[PDB]
Design a protein around this ligand. Structure first.
Ligand SMILES: O[C@@H]1[C@@H](O)[C@H](O)OC[C@H]1O
Ligand SMILES: O[C@@H]1[C@@H](O)[C@H](O)OC[C@H]1O
Ligand SMILES: O[C@@H]1[C@@H](O)[C@H](O)OC[C@H]1O
Ligand SMILES: O[C@@H]1[C@@H](O)[C@H](O)OC[C@H]1O
Ligand SMILES: [Ca+2]
Ligand SMILES: [Ca+2]
Ligand SMILES: [Ca+2]
Ligand SMILES: [Ca+2]
Ligand SMILES: [Zn+2]
Length: 316
């Protein structure tokens, strides 16, 4: 909508207060004009018609329980935009400041979030498996990274290319979480997963096997569930990325960590320069090696650590 840019305040899913960029035109809309061509947050009103209604508020104060998922989807979309612009010089998910749109209150008791090819969508959870999923910055960044992937490598969402697609979203979801620097970890979804169970998460990058996901290529799932296990075999790549950044000895193979920033530069370059829709795990290794070579040289520790990490998870 056309209006004047202003700043509101509210509370997110976890009860934390934050300011949000809004637009005033009779009502205050969750429309942030300070980033690219706008960040727009919508209310699906417990239905599945998308995008729903652009979120309208009468007084620019968003402290109602019903407001919280919108606050966080809107705010964390902005953080993720900032990450890609400030860290990778990428303007929104298409590189040309495409508008970022998010809908919350999707359906009833919906225990998931997703990028639908045009926008992000967040369920409220059922209060047992999940609370509203936009409360997790790694979830928000995970989904928006799917958009980045769709506009760059275009990894098909099945089998190994789909598992890479998932891992990329977990990797940059985590790197955005570290970028914002509020309780950062190498776990996925911990902030919105199982409110009645402490210390758990949906996936682990540091130890995928914690939740039954493979941490080595020999353990990859080869059935048909989950589009060929795209959320399962992602653990193999998540572990490799974790090792590149943090180091460790995995199945007896030692990896010297090079830190989160260099992990991001290597995998972002791989994603945007070398990966293709049909890339498999072995092609990802080559892409990451070439990216590290571009950035730091063929004889660098960085290239060495990329090789060790993929060796450690059995990807040749
Ligand atoms: O879980 C939902 C909650 O996030 C919202 O605030 O009010 C409706 C609930 O279904
Ligand atoms: O209570 C909710 C209210 O906060 C919102 O503004 O409109 C929908 C209602 O369910
Ligand atoms: O607020 C209620 C919400 O919790 C549920 O998801 O659908 C019915 C609504 O009235
Ligand atoms: O999937 C397994 C899980 O069920 C168990 O609790 O801990 C080990 C995991 O491999
Ligand atoms: Ca209000
Ligand atoms: Ca965390
Ligand atoms: Ca996390
Ligand atoms: Ca939990
Ligand atoms: Zn995903």
């Amino acid at each position: 909508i056309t209006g004047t840019s202003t700043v509101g305040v509210g509370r997110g899913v976890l009860g934390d207060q934050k300011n949000i960029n809004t637009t005033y035109s009779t009502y205050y809309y969750l429309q942030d004009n300070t980033r690219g061509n706008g960040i727009f947050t919508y209310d699906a009103k417990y239905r599945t018609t998308l995008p729903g209604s652009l979120w309208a508020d009468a007084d620019n104060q968003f402290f109602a329980s019903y407001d919280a998922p919108a606050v966080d989807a809107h705010y964390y979309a902005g953080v993720t935009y900032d990450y890609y612009k400030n860290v990778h010089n990428r303007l929104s998910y298409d590189g040309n400041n495409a508008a970022i749109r998010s809908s919350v209150h999707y359906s009833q008791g919906y225990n998931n979030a997703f990028w639908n090819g045009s926008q992000m969508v967040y369920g409220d959870g059922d209060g047992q498996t999940f609370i509203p999923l936009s409360g997790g910055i790694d979830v928000v960044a995970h989904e928006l990274t799917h958009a980045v992937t769709d506009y760059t490598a275009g990894l098909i969402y099945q089998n190994e290319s789909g598992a890479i697609n998932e891992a990329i979203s977990d990797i940059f979801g985590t790197l955005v979480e570290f970028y914002a620097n509020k309780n950062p970890d190498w776990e996925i979804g911990e902030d919105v997963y199982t409110p009645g169970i402490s210390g758990d998460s949906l996936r682990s990058m540091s130890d995928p096997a914690k939740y039954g996901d493979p941490d080595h290529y020999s353990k990859r799932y080869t059935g048909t569930q989950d589009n060929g296990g795209v959320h399962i075999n992602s653990g193999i790549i998540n572990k490799a990325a974790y090792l590149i950044s943090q180091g460790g000895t995995h199945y007896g193979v030692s990896v010297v960590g090079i830190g989160r920033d260099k992990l991001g530069k290597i995998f972002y370059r791989a994603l945007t320069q070398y990966l293709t829709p049909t890339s498999n795990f072995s092609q990802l290794r080559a892409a990451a090696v070439q990216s590290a070579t571009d950035l730091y040289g063929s004889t660098s520790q960085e290239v060495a650590s990329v090789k060790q990490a993929f060796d450690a998870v059995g990807v040749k």
